[PDB]
Every structure is written in C-alpha cells, then in structure tokens.
Amino acid sequence: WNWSKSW
Amino acid sequence: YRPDINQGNYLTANDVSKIRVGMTQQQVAYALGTPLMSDPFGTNTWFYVFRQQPGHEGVTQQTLTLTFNSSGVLTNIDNKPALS
Amino acid sequence: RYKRQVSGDEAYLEAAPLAELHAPAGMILPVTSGDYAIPVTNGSGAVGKALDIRPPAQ
Amino acid sequence: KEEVPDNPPNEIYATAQQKLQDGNWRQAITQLEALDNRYPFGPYSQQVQLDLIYAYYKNADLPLAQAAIDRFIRLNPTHPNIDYVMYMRGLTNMALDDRSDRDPQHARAAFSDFSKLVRGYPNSQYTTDATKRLVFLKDRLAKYEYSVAEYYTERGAWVAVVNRVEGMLRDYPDTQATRDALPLMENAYRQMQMNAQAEKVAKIIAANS
Amino acid sequence: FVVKDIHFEGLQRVAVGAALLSMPVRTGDTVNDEDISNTIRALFATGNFEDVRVLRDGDTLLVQVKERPTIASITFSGNKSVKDDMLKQNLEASGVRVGESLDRTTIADIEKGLEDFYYSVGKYSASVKAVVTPLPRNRVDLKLVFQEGVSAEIQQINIVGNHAFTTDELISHFQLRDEVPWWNVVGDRKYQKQKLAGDLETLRSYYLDRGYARFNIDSTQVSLTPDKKGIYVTVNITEGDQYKLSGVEVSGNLAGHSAEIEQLTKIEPGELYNGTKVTKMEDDIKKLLGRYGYAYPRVQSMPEINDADKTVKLRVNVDAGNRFYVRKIRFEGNDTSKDAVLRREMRQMEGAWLGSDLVDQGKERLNRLGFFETVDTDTQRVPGSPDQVDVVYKVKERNTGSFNFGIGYGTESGVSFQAGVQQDNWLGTGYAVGINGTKNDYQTYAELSVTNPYFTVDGVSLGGRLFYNDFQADDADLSDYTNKSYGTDVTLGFPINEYNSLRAGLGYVHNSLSNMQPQVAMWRYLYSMGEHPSTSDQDNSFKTDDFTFNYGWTYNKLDRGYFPTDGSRVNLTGKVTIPGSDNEYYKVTLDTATYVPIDDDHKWVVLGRTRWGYGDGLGGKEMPFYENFYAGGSSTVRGFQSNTIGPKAVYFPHQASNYDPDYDYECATQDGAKDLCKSDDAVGGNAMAVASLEFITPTPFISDKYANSVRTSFFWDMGTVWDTNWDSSQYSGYPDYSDPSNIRMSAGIALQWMSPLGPLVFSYAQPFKKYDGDKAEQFQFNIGKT
Amino acid sequence: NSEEDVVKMSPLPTVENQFTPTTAWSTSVGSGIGNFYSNLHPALADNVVYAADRAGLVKALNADDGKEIWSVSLAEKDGWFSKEPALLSGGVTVSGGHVYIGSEKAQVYALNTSDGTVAWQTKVAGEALSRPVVSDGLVLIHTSNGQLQALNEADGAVKWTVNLDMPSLSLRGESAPTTAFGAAVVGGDNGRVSAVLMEQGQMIWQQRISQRLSDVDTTPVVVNGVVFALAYNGNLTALDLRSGQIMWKRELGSVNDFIVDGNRIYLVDQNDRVMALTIDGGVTLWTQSDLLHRLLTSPVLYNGNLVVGDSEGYLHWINVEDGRFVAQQKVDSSGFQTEPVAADGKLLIQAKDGTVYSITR
C-alpha cells in the first residue's frame, strides 16, 4: 500500500 | 562527467576576418556582436572571448582584444587563436 | 512563520559601516550609476527598540 | 468563534486599544476587523486602519499588512501621517525577507521603500532607522551577488564571475562583499590569461588592503 | 430650469464633492428633462444606488436616492466538491466581493455565474440559491445554498471511420476513460475539454506514426443523456492509405552547414512515412544548429503527397536565426532553497551564447528535483542591447518533508510493515536526511541516512547511513541463529555517462550472533575464527567487528521504469574487509536483466535475467555464514520455497532448550541421536548462479482497452547454490554440497499489475527438476511492495 | 464518500387497480441495451415481434406464444475467439418484408423477415442513432453528425444527403423524421425544425422553436397540415406544414415523444409531468405530477389509457379524461427506458435486460 503524507 | 562549459562571444573565424582597422564601434558590433566583457577601468577595450570546454576534452579559447580610441574608432586588434 | 516570528517582532541587526573604494593612480573604478545610494540624513532619531512604532492618535 | 457583541464603536475601540497596550494581538485583529466592517465610513476609520496594520504586522500576518498598506496609500496619498505607513511597508518587506543566498526580491523592495521614505520625508522620526536598515539591506544584496560569483568561480565559468563582480563594483562599490569579491575577479582574469586586467585588479586590491 | 442650489438625500458613503463631480449638471446652470434623465442614468450606473429619483422642489433641486446596502460577509453551504477559497476567488473575480455594494437585481447574474462554474467543474445539474439578509447600517449578508448534484461521467468513447485499427486499441492510449475496473488502476472516468484535445492529438499521432499521411479528424461530438448523468463522445475521422517516404530535401539559410545537415536527413528509399521520425529529424537539425551558437533555429516540414504512387516527399525549410547571449540567470521564488541549489541544475551557463534546448533542459531538471510545484521560464530582452537576454526562472516551492507508512504481504516475507520520515531539502541546503524502518516476518531494520547529492559540483555524491538490523534465521527457512548487527556507512558516487554510475565507500559493521544450532557448516567456520564452542548445547554467542570497503557499479539503460520493454540493466557489487577487522573475506555479486522486443509495437518481449555471486575468505578463514547466498523464492527461482536451494544443514547431536513431546525437534539428544544428522532446511552456499528466461506476451482474456496494464509472462528459471569449502572426503555418506552440477529448474506462468492495494504479482511454477531436500511451493505472490 | 441528487426521486405512488394486468409472455434477448442510452425497441408486423440487443443479436418471436422463429447475430467474428460488438442503436423498423436496424458504427442493416439473412448493409456518415423511418420507397436515417440521409430500400446506396447544423454540446439521441405529403420534417439537435423534399433534399423551410442551453426535437408529429414540435428545454409549438409560421406556442420542453388523439395532445414533460394539452390553443386539461423525476418513458395510448414505464420498472396506467392513476404493475427490476409499442391490440415493452414483455388485461 504505502501512504505518504507531507508535513 | 560534467556538461559542456561555454563562455563568451561565438567567433565564427569569418567575422573576425571581416573587421579591419579604421571603423567605428557600430560596425564592429554589427559584425561580431556586443561583447560579453569590456574594460571598465577607464580605457576603452572590448574582449571577445570564445571559450569552450566539453566533457573531459580540455579547454579551447580564442581571444580577440579590440582597442578603440577616444572617439570610438577602432585602433588596434590583437588575436590569440589559442591559450598557452 | 517561525522564522518570521523573531524578525518581525523585535530582532534588529547593525551591520558594518560603508567605506568608499579607493582608486589607484592611473585608472578609474567603474562608474557607480547611483542605483543603490544612501543619502545623508541629518538628525538623531531613535533606533533598536528605542523607536516606538505604535500608530499615532490620528 | 470569537464573536464580537454589537457594542457601540467607542467601547469596542477602547477594548481594542487596551488589548493592544496589554500585548495581545490575535484578539485585536478580530475587534478591529469587526469595527471596520461595521463602520466602513465611520468617524475614525483611518485610525482603526492604522491600528489594524500595526496589529497585522506584529502578528506575523505580513501579506495582510502589505495589502492594508497598499490600500491606505491608494486611498489617502495626502494623509499627513503617511510617513508611518511607508515605514511600515518597509518593515513588512524587510520582515518578509526573513539566508543571503535566497532570493533578494523582498530585500530590493524594502530598499526601494526605505529610499522613497528617506528622500521624501527626511525630517521625520523614522529617518535614522530607515538609513540604518538601508545600510544592512545594501550589504545583504551585495552578499547575494558575491555568493553567485563564488558559485560561478566554483563551476568554472570565467566570464560570469567577471561580469558579476563588475556589476557589483558598479552597483555596490562601498560594501564588504565587493572588497571580499575583488580577488574572485582577479582570479577569473588570471585563468583566462588576461594578465593586464589581472594586474589592474591587483592594483585595485593593493591600494585598499 | 435655472439651478441655484444642489442638495442630496441619502448619501452615506459617497462624498458630496465626488457626487457633484459625477453629475455633469453643476450649480448655476439651466436644467431640463434631458439633463435630469442623464443625471439619473449616471447615478444608476455608478453602482452605489438602487433607486434614483430626481425631483425639483420649489426653488432647489432635491435628490432622493436609495444607496445600495454594503456587503458585510458571504457564506456557503453544500460546496462539498468545491473548495471554499477558490469559490470565493471565483466570486470576487466575477465582481461580487466584500466591501462593495450589492445590487438587488444582479442576484440572477451571480446565480448563473456559479451555475456556469459548476457546469465547468463537471456537475451539469447543480442548483444554487441566493439569500439576502438585510442588517442595520444599510448592510447586507449574501448566503449561498448549493445542491451540487451527481457528476456526469463518460459512458462511451466511440470512433467511427476506422477500418485498420479496432476502436479498443485506439481508446487504450486515451486519457479519457469509459471503463475503470475495480481491480486495476487506469484512471478516473470524468470529462474535461483539455483532456479531449490532448486525446485527439494522441489519436492523430497514433495514426501518423503508421504512414497515414492523409489522416483527418472530421469532427468530434459530445452528448449528454437527458438526465445529464452520462457523457457520450464520438470522433468522426477519415484515414487514408499508408504512404512511403521517397526522399527529403533541405533548403534555407543553413549558414554553411549543408554537409553536416544533409547527413541527418538520410532515409532508406521505401520506408513507411512516419510522424515521430520526422519530428526527431527536425529536433536533431535544431540541436545541430544550436550547438553552433544559434538560439532560435526555426525548422519546418511541409510534406508533398503524391497519391498516384502513394509517396510522401518532405520539404524541410531551415531558418537559422541569430545568436543571443545570456547575461543574467535570475531565480525568483526560491525563498527557502539557496541559490546554488537551483543554479547547479543548469545546463545553460551565464555569460554564454543562448540555447533554447539548454534552457528547456534546465527547466526539466529543476522539475525533476521535486522541490517546486511549478517552474516557469521567461527570457527578457535587455534594454539597449540588440542580442542580449536575461533568463528568469520563477519557482513555486513545496513542503518537501514527508511521513509515510506502508503495509505489504507476500509468501516470501509475510506481512511487512514500513515506516519513515524524510526531508529532501534539509533547511533548503539540498541534503536529503531521513529515518526509515521495516519489519517483516524474519527481521527488523532501522536506518538513519544523510545524503549530500552534490558533494562536488560535477555531481559526485556523498551519503552516510547508520543502521541496526536484527535477523531471525529460524523464521526465514534457514538453520536456527539470531543475528543482531549495527553499523555505519559512507559512500561516494560518480555518475560517469548518465547510465553508468560507479560508487565506492567504507563501512563498519558489528554482528552479534547467538542461539546457534549445532551443525557442520558454522563450526567449520567458528573453528577458523579461533572459537571452540561446545556442540552439545545451543547457548552460544559470537561478536565480530568488520571494516568493509564496498565498491559497486550500475548501468540502467531501461526505457521505462514500470513494465520496461527495451534495454538492459546491470549491477555489480562487491565487498572486502581491509586488514585489522576480525573477519577477512571478499564478496562479489552481479545482477543482470535484458529486454529484447521482437516486434514493432513492443508487445511480445523476451526478458533474460541472471544473478551470479561468489565470496570466500582470504587469510585462511571462511566467509561468515551470515553473508551467504540464498537462492529460491518468488524472485530468484520461482516454484521453490524461499531460501531452500543449496546446501542443507548437517546437525550435531545436541540437547534442546526445553524438550517436550508432540513438538518436532531437529534430532536432539533426547531422541536417540548419537551421530551426525541430516536435515532438509537450507543453509545457503558461498557460490550462487541463477538464470531466467521469460517470454512476455499480451494478456489473452482481457479486453484490449486496458490489456496493456497487465503483464503476462511464461518463464523458465534455473539456478544453483553451492558451498565451495565443504570437504567431501570426511563426510562421504552425506551428499556432496560443493558440486555445482546440481541445477534446479522450474517453469511456469506469472501475472503482474497494479491494484489499489499496490503492485500485485502472482506466479505459478512447477519445479520439474529438484533434488532431495528441496521444498517446492507452486503458488507465490507479492502484494503492496512493503 | 457520499452521493446526493439535486432533485429527489418521487416516491412510488399508491393506487387501487380497477383492472388486474398480467403478462402473457416474457422472452429474453441477450443482455438488452445494457445501461447505455439507446432507441432500440421491438416492432410488430403481421403477427411477429422483432427484437434486438446492443451486443448485436436479433430475434423474431411469435406475438402470441413467444416461440422463436429465427435468430441472427450481427457481430462479425474473426475466428472462434474474437467477437467485436455490433452496437445496434437504431430502433427496429419493419416495412415490406425487411428489418432495418441502425448501429453505432455508422452502419445500417436490412435483415430479411423470412430467414434473417442480410439483404443489404450500408455505411452512413455517422452513428445512425435514430429510428430508420421508411416511406416512399426510401429509408430515412438521422445520423449523429446532423446529416439526414435517404438510403434506397432495394439497393442500399445513399440516394441523397442533407446537412443539419450541430452544436458543441447536445443530448444523446436523434430525431426520426415523419413524412407527410412528399416531404420529411425533421428536428435537429440545434433547435431547428426543417422540412426537406424527398426527391432531392431541397430545404423547403426551417424554423427555430427553441428558447450553455441545449435542445432537441425528437420526432415532430403531423396532423391535418399542422406540425407539432416539442423541443427540449424549449417550447412546444404548432407550425404550418407549408409556411412554417408559428401558430401557437407553450413553454414546456421534453425529449421523449408525445401523442395526439382527437383534440388532445398527451405529452410527458422533461420533469416527468404527464400533461394533456389542447390542439386549438394548448390550454391544459389536467396534469399528473405524482411521478416527478422518475425518468419515465414515452407514453403509449393502449385501450384509451396512457401506459408509461419508469426507472424501477413499474408500469403505470393513467386515465385520459382527468389524469387519475388507473393501475400500476411491477414487470421488471432492471427498468424501462425504450418506448412501448402498441398495435393490433397488443402492448409490448423491452426492459434494459432485453426481456421483451407483452402486457394485457
């Protein structure tokens, strides 16, 4: 999956 | 490894032979172009440098120094086809 | 934001004075063109937290 | 949500002034915005606008301060106390500058603003601080130019270094960046074998340090 | 009517002087009906008044005017799919904004404007309602109630007039979609004009690349169903016959480069006309002319079509411009990233003759950096100079930090969690710091990395990395031993060709091994290191420190990252412990993949993969058993249980930890074991050789619209792992594990694609050549990519 | 993640059945027209019912028992594996021992009523979305490019073509011309009702009856020398068949067809309001707004009552004199979209699953 939320 | 490094005016080896001694700044500017370097320290002089340095092939430079007079008339031309 | 929370509020810096550039004999330094010039200002106003920037009563 | 009771302008203005004196900002913006919206053409709208500009600037909402200052200059070019607005615009731009390598456009805007203030109203009370900030901004711009020249010396371009240092000498002749960057121009001339110009630059360097 | 005084009734905001200036009529002049009407019209058009009434009193001209209420606030309700800020921006652009006046007759105009905006964004049945709330001080509040409705989606993209290519094939490449399966990731199913234009251009390029020079799109239709919940698209076209390329001629002011240009326009007589090759030829001529100092070398192609013999004869017109010199490269918008970070990505050099291709390369590189939302270029002519420019780059910056947490599954590794926090532009300096961690069925890895991508202006990098790695062997189908290691690393990197990338560096690694199951393989290596542990128990421990020098090399020619169809990747890696470390061994590995398309559309492909490896000790010692090579699994040899190929353990007779019946023990002492004991659990060997031949074919039973997003392969993998130091003389009874002729093969099928859960790969292999001990596993799969 | 509609679908009305309807037979055709928007529907001729599906299949059924007479698949197959859909979208028509069917590939097929063999097949300018009208030994097709073409019944070659302007955005579907006194009156997707001579295709006249606003006409009808034309989101109008001067107009727009009987005009507004206007001046007699936003179908006058389908599949019988519901029935669960056909005392309707239903009482 791999979610990627930026600061 | 690096990209190509280019600097200064592009001298075609044909325009440089098209300028004699006795013309004004306008004619030399029309022939070769506007120099990327000058002599700001008082005296009037135009340095057409054609320097290039591609990927690991050394540096090749052609220098052309034009010395004008007080009235903007070409007085001296000094050509160095390669750098020592 | 956090970078501006210090500069905006009170932080102030004083830099070194400007000194003219001497021209050796037999040559002239490039003309200045006066693009970025600092005119001489008389008087002694406040500076560095001594100058209140609160709006006046008008 | 920070609702403001429909009190008369006098009481709400007094509360806003007291809050400004206390040292609290976030609420002052709310009260002043409410007052201005409720009385667009009120008896003292201009003073409320000035207080709002001050609160916005000191609350770190610089874009709103810029917009308010632009509006104030547009509407009232002849306001007797306008020098304060120019000084506040200069402060806002200089704070947006917030790092000498990063882009200087805000430093340039601040320098232009402070120059206009000093040349227009030289007898005001913000003139000395204006000049003290102008000196620093000039030095910062010169440092940025010297940074670019240093990078182009690293890269290997000997006509960008010469041109940029010549531009620095043309625009910023009496700063520290120029005196620190003259050797870069000397080296650039030396590496292209323009020994006469290298000697001229060495003459310039020797006569100073 | 002579006027002696002027008065107004109702002026609150507008000043008396401004109003007097507005009205052409002035005090002390004759006034008639025409003047009054004109003044009333002027007041009406001012926008500050709703009703204007000008009447003449006994002597004075009294004016009754109702100033429009001023706008105080705006509210929205129901803008689920529309952001409030952009809706407010649209309103203010339309004209209605805070501070100004509100008209009581322009409500319909605002309603229709918002309706137009919703029709633009996709919702064709949206409704908007405006509510006006008066408030004291002649103020007004405008509330908007939105019923967005159901968005309209594409139901069909049809093409009529195509006889050579089926509709599904042509639609496969379009951006607009009509079928979006749940098990695939193809895209949304919405409609936008820009997408339609781009897709028409894509179709034109699709035909023009096959020689249909006379191609022409007659007309495009877009239709809605009566309920406005579906969109039908049609593209009436007309395709001609295939055309051959007879020849090419170049004419213009080439600037004395005909000899070097006529070489670029060589074509085999009888080639099928192409649209991509002609564009590439134009680009090559442009690059040749720009390499000589020209900035804007215009090039045009005007094909001549002869239908009698079906021949296309190009006519290239080349207009090489005049040189322009850059004087300043200015970057604006980089409020965080230092100037050098942006400037070191430039191919164009300040102080040099201009080149458009170089400027575009610089813009593309800045985009590829990833710190900027938008990078725009602007070449501004310097005033007073005829041939000098300044190149300005305007960059909008992102917040480059990131958190990320991923989950994956797979038979090879079980449930695998990953977490990480990364900063790619640390303080705008260009350093890319990060902390990463992974945890799967048989290890836990945690690293802290700090990379400087431009340690030297040329491009040489310099990275460092701390890492802690815990490895449980028993959970990976190996002999029982737990290995907790930690260490540092520093590595350079020298990009040398844009494909090759050397890299050399140092590193320090400390390994603590414990809970080692007695067997021949390790205690042939423990004895080398001087250890003399007891083989009757498994309460062992061994700590080693190594100072390795890691070198490598890469070569990445693949054209596409995902589903490559042509190219070759090679990857050589090494390792060697410099003197002073406890261990003394050298290790080498070589991975290879090569794709060889066997058609013109790159649909049938041949993929050859290889993986070689060899390592051994130097000073009379052996390679550590925790660095061995394991073969077999979902990636190396499909069809064999992960880490099963190679030598098998030969356990000693040992007492277990806590023996208990009903539990299988590796022939411990309490089972009547009195000699060396065979086993069927792999140990890995110090020499690896694996190969794989794969035939990639189009998916057979999938509709051609999205049959290019699923890759089907028929593969034949083979491999072997052997232990070179094994001595066959002493252990004669047991199999010879030092023999490399024991090859293991397995053929089967493989499917791969991308699902919303991540990259899914499935494989079914039937090992038709395996030796005693090997454990087969027909069905393997990976989901999610950690 | 949620979805909502601007207009709420009206609740299913409750009614008492004065008569109990039934279902004589229900044959299945392959996959019906699916979820797409098509004009495909059955037709009757000499006690036999022809039906088709979007896939390409065509079937002939007995109108009394549902027995199959013949079946033919029009999807060309390039071997035992590949099978390209035929995309039939032109309403089935029958005349003189033929079965004319349109298509979305700009093809017009003319099957034989005897054994289903293709008598001829022609290529037209665009997607032949309209009903293939038949008259004066010509087959009129209204493509999706606005081009009205007239194929020959016997040969199958385009005899003449007339170009009608097309807008940027339009409503899916095309108008089927009605022919009267040797002239075909057709309404394009540009809001223009135009009359064309059949001999060559000379535009006799063209009138705008419209009012991003689109419109469509969908088969204006002719009676006693007056043409009634109803334009979507426009206004119903009565035009003179000879001059085109607007006789009377009324602000109401729809796409699905209407009907005229005696001195009454029963139509279905776009908002699903079954109304009955008067020919003389268009003064309404009654309105049945109880089915608002139910996505009705074109009404059919069966046994003096309007039968209309809907999205859920319920079939409603409503009276004529006053507008009171007379009955309702649950026929299919997929839903009804194609117009019912009433003829020879037989009412037939095709669902979205292709299951042709025959209704009675």
Numbering used by the authors:
A (entry chain G): 1 to 7
B (entry chain E): 28 to 111
C (entry chain C): 30 to 87
D (entry chain D): 24 to 121, 132 to 242
E (entry chain A): 24 to 809
F (entry chain B): 24 to 234, 243 to 392
Excerpt from the publication:
To determine if D9 shares the same binding site as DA, we first resolved the cryo‐EM structure of the E. coli BAM complex bound to D9. While the overall average resolution was determined to be 3.4 Å, the local resolution the D9 estimated using Cryosparc revealed a resolution of 3.0 Å around binding region. D9 also binds to the β1 of the lateral gate of BamA with multiple hydrogen bonds in antiparallel β‐sheet conformation, mimicking a β‐sheet extension thereby blocking the functional region of BamA. Moreover, the N‐ and C‐terminal ends of D9 are also tightly anchored to BamA via electrostatic and hydrophobic interactions. Of note, D9 is more tightly bound to BamA, as shown by comparison with native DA, which could be explained by additional side chain and backbone interactions of l‐tryptophan at position 1 with NH of I430, at position 6 with the carbonyl group of N422, and at position 7 with the carbonyl group of S425. The novel hydrogen bond interactions and accompanied changes in D9 orientation are at the expense of l‐asparagine hydrogen bond interaction on position 2 with the carbamoyl oxygen of the side chain (Oδ2) of N427. Remarkably, the C‐terminal carboxyl group of the terminal tryptophan forms a shorter hydrogen bond with NHδ2 of N422 in contrast to l‐phenylalanine. Furthermore, the aromatic group of the C‐terminal tryptophan of D9 is significantly extended into the hydrophobic pocket formed by residues F426 and V444, potentially generating strong hydrophobic interactions. Taken together, the additional interaction sites of D9 result in tighter binding, providing (1) structural evidence for the basis of 8‐fold enhanced activity of D9 over DA and (2) proof of concept that additional chemical alterations on DA could further improve binding as well as biological activity.
